[PDB]
């Protein structure tokens, strides 16, 4: 029936809502009002979700979280990693997009932003499991979820990222992660973790839930002693130079998987040598885009807005390849990158510069359907 | 002491509010984070104000509230005017900002959109007075306001309109003015009457206040029956084309006063000889600038966003003269009309276009001294 053969999951980054966890008011994620991805490419005859995974959770509490959206089952952070960082072990419950996700029948991966690193943890946990977990279980017996045992592949058919930190942002290390403002991002998860509230922002395994009967006096008194306020099992950290290469150091390359990265540029040079944001980069982003841009490092600077090139690219130090817009991108166990895109900012990538006027939704609804066709020939050439 | 003789007045257009009277979080009207101008211009020893007059009421009920600005007293409408609109004839009452102004003490007139409109009708009440005030003055006795008597000349020295409609808008004849919208806007004001609201969106006196007593159910079935639903005593019916020209049909040219016109162009020539906005026109203006620039008749297509340039340059049936950007605006009694300013749209005249980086302070600043400077010559050739 579906076109592609193998379902395509679209993974969010940071501070991304999506579906019926989306506020009230609150741009489509995947597409702005643009180009609709997930209702166009239904329409078109492609089988596509979009995953919902923490929007401010480490790459790790994001990959589990992953896992379970698309296996279905109960979120497992693992005993080791929950005893480790002074979380919750278990989170929320999936229905499971495939809940006959097995060695044997693949998913496609794609990525924005944080999504593309969190979909690099998951490979990473299918494949070689999580060896805190397994020396864990070892040790002291209990459960082990399957995600963390290793062994299993055959489960994705490719990677593909797109404006994604590889190597980290300074606009992570700089502003992001600084006290003043994870103490911002923090007191918006207590506040909407309220008893009212229908939206969850991805850190209630860390307390932030207010109980029926508690008022809002001892909410704020019962989590403040949570480690959250302390602790590196955070986005914020996990986007900083030093997170993502943590990530980069314990990920490998898989043979079988088709990598490919996309990456803009909306900075333009200073007659100094420093980058400033172009016009019409989403105007959000006009400090952040100074921040990398100004940086010691020259190759450092150009940037989409909130991501630097270098980082977009693909993990340093892992093989690559770049490759032309023309060519099959058919090549498995390497980084396949795509010709910078010139002009689009972090958020021309999904539509939602609603104010940039030459980023047409013409022209993304192209961009998304030659992912698809990239995606089709990779299950052509199996 | 101050080094212009005359006060100088700023008059905002339709929606403005100032000082006190602004929202919690709502732009500065004169100047945005740009260039504030009565700070500044304070700052730089010359005698400035910003008049507070109905955001959304007629320029009927704002040249009334405009006088009693700056005479101080209580606001009169007329009589005669309060019974034929079906609204109170008295509301709120101003300290005064010149309590001695009389013949012989002039002040100077600024105004922005619907403010330049509403500058001129004020002129028209105290040169010839309204003649329907008088015959009611004539037949029931009572008191009539100086407003309304005639022949005080000798009081304002100049006028100068920045982006005003003085022939009128389809944005109201087609946006603004339409059934659908007159709801939405009384709507607002019936619920910023509401008993915990600090701000007076100026209908007040069409019955937009709550009681302390009163339910927001019966404030409800009580304003319903207000006239304001069907009147033409507002701001919306006053900026269309026929709202407008009958402003122009009864005002005349004082030939003491020094009148000068300015007009912003940010529209462009698409393929077909139709008018779009450019990039940098103030977003909330996309839709009105199409709306203006598609016009059947090709010289009422150019625009600012919200005022077509025909509209802006001069009333259309007063006498004018195109005047260079250097030679002194010292003509008395003809319409000046300054070059367009190329780029500005509608809101660039008064900075709040915050997101617009070609429109920079120090550009605001020498537009806002160049207007003082010419009023300065008003004074120094009497
Ligand atoms: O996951 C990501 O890709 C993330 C890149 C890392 C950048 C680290 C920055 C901490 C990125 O998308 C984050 C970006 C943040 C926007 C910053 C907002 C600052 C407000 C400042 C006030 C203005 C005056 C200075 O997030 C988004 O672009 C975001 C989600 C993305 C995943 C698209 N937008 C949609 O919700
Ligand atoms: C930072 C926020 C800036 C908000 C600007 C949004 C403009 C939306 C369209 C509103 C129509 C325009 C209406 C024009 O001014 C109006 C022109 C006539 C237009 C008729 C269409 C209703 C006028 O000149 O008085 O209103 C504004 O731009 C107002 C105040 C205006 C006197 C400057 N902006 C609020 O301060
Ligand atoms: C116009 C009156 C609305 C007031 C109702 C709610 C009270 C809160 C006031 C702040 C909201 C003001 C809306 C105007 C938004 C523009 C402000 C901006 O440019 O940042
Ligand atoms: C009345 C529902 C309130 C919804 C909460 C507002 C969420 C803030 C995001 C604003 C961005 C936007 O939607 O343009
Ligand atoms: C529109 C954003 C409003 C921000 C107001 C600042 C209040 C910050 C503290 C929040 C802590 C909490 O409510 O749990
Ligand atoms: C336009 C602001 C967004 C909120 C929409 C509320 C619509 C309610 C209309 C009735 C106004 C009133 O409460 O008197
Ligand atoms: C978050 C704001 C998004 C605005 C999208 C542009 C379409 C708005 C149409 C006209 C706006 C108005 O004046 O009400
Ligand atoms: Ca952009
Ligand atoms: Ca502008």
Redesign the pocket.
């Given at each position: 029936q579906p076109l592609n053969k193998y379902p395509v999951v679209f993974v969010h980054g940071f501070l991304g809502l999506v579906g019926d966890n989306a506020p009230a008011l609150y741009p489509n994620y995947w597409g702005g009002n643009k180009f609709k991805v997930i209702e166009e490419l239904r329409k078109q005859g492609y089988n596509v979700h979009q995953a919902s995974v923490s929007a401010f959770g480490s790459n790790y509490d994001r990959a589990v979280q992953l896992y379970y959206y698309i296996k279905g089952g109960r979120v497992d952070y693992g005993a080791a990693h929950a005893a480790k960082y002074g979380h919750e072990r278990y989170g929320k419950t999936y229905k499971g997009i495939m809940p006959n996700w097995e060695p044997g029948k693949k998913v496609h991966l794609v990525g924005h932003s944080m999504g593309g690193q969190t979909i690099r943890l998951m490979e990473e946990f299918l494949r070689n499991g999580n060896k805190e977990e397994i020396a864990y279980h070892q040790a002291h017996g209990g459960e082990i979820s399957p995600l963390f045992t290793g062994g299993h592949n055959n489960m994705v058919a490719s990677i593909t990222t797109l404006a994604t930190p590889h190597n980290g942002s300074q606009a992570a290390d700089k502003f992001g992660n600084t006290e003043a403002v994870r103490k911002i991002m923090f007191?918006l998860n207590?506040?909407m973790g309220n008893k009212y509230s229908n939206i969850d922002l991805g850190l209630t395994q860390w307390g932030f839930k207010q109980l029926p009967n508690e008022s809002y006096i001892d909410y704020?008194k019962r989590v403040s002693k949570s480690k959250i306020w302390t602790s590196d099992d955070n986005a914020a950290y996990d986007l900083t130079l030093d997170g993502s290469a943590k990530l980069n150091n314990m990920t490998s390359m898989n043979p079988n998987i088709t990598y490919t990265t996309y990456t803009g540029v909306s900075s333009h040079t200073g007659p100094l040598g420093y980058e400033n944001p172009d016009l019409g980069t989403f105007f959000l982003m006009d400090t952040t885009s100074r921040i990398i841009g100004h940086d010691a490092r020259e190759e450092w600077r150009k940037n989409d807005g909130v991501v630097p090139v270098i980082s977009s690219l693909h993990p340093s130090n892992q093989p690559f390849v770049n490759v032309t817009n023309n060519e099959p991108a058919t090549r498995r166990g390497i980084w396949q990158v795509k010709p910078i895109l010139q002009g689009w900012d972090h958020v021309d990538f999904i539509g939602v510069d609603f104010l940039d006027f030459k980023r047409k939704g013409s022209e993304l609804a192209n961009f998304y359907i030659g992912i698809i066709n990239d995606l089709l020939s990779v299950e052509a050439t199996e």
């Open positions: 007191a207590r506040f704020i």
